[PDB]
Each structure stands twice: as structure tokens, then as C-alpha cells.
Amino acid sequence: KSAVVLCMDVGLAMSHSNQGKESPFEQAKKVMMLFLQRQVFAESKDEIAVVLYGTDTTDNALAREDQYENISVHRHLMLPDFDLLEQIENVVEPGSVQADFLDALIVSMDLLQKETLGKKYTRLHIAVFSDLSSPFSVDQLEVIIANLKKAEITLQFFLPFSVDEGSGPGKGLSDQQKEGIEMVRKIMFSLDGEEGLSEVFTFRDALERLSIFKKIER
């Protein structure tokens, strides 16, 4: 059994609808719903948590004055069940603010650390869905990375646009998004070198890649 956190950006920028027929928020929610439906119908034993960042309210164990704001734990580390699909397609609404994705990553790591205590897993995994529009602080990032390594948590990033060599003409990414892309690459290379950079995907590939990974003895 895997332990997986779906760490979903629901910030205001995700609502802006200008490619295709669906906003980044709608695309990401659709992927999440399809993934959870597959897991339920297949009676998978993987446990799946859901953390939202960019939510108007705050609900997480680390939240205090000016810390880990606008991050909400929507689903704890449990088996997905039929009843959750309804719960997801009702309490996943777009937020009106932005939040710090490294704060959201820490909340997700803390969730895994507490809720995997005393149990055996094939892997511990965090999958981030975001357009990287929101500012973030790199304070103590080196400790975040150290702890990801120590706990043997792997990371995957899913973005609504390509960033690889075939990405083609420019997509009008903001400087903040370009900074977010660069920091994602630094994090993934810190964790697994060139192979980690390969774990940055688009929304279009997310449903299928969420299941694929390299086995590492724990």
C-alpha cells in the first residue's frame, strides 16, 4: 500500500479560464476525481489524503498567527471510499487568495509523518497540482529537503503547461511562475538528480503518471 497526499492549488489564479474549455482548477479537480474513482472501483489499498492551499479558511495542525495560512486538510490519510468522491466534488471550490506551496508541502509532510506512524508502506508520496502563480518563501528549504530524504518521501509536480524542451512557443508565464518552475527543478534535482527533473509533468499526463514510480527498498 502507498501513502499519497494530493496537494492541490486552489488559489484565485487557478480559476482564470483561458485555455481550452476548463480552467486549471477545473482540470486539476477532474484529474483528482478520475484518480479517486479509479482507486475506489479497483478496491486499491492505497491511502490517499487531500490538502488544499489557497483556501479562504485555514484548517491544519501547524496553523498559527501568520504561519501555514490558507491551507486546509480536506481528507486525512485513509482509504478512499465511495463516500469521499461526493465529499471531494462538493468541498473542493476555488479559493479567493493565494498560499505558499512550500508551507503546503510542510503540512503534507507533517500529515504523512503523523498518520503513517507504526505502519508499513511501499512508498510515501506527495503529488502537487499548481500553476505556480503564488509567491513562496524559501526559508529553511534545506531542512524541508533533508526531511523529505530522511522520511523517504518522493515528490511529483503537475502543472497546467509544459516546461520541457518541446514546450514550444512562449505561454506568457509570469516571472513568479518562472521562479516557481526553477525552484521546483532545484527541489527535484536535490532529491533525485536528473531523474527527479523527469517527475515534473502536465495535467494531461497526471492521471496515468500518478501510478508509475521506481521501487526503492525501505
Binding site: 495542525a61 501547524l62 498559527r64 504561519q67 501555514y68 505558499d100 512550500l102 508551507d103 510542510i106 509532510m109 507533517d110 509523518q113 518563501s137 524559501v138 526559508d139 529553511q140 531542512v143 524541508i144 526531511n147
Partner: peptide, 13 residues
């Protein structure tokens, strides 16, 4: 840079 406070378990030696 905005300072964050990490949970104690992340600061353990």
C-alpha cells in the same frame, strides 16, 4: 525573506 517555523519533529537531530 518570510520566516517560517517548522514543526519540532523536522528539527530533530
Amino acid at each position: 525573506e518570510r520566516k517560517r517555523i517548522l514543526p519540532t519533529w523536522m528539527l530533530a537531530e
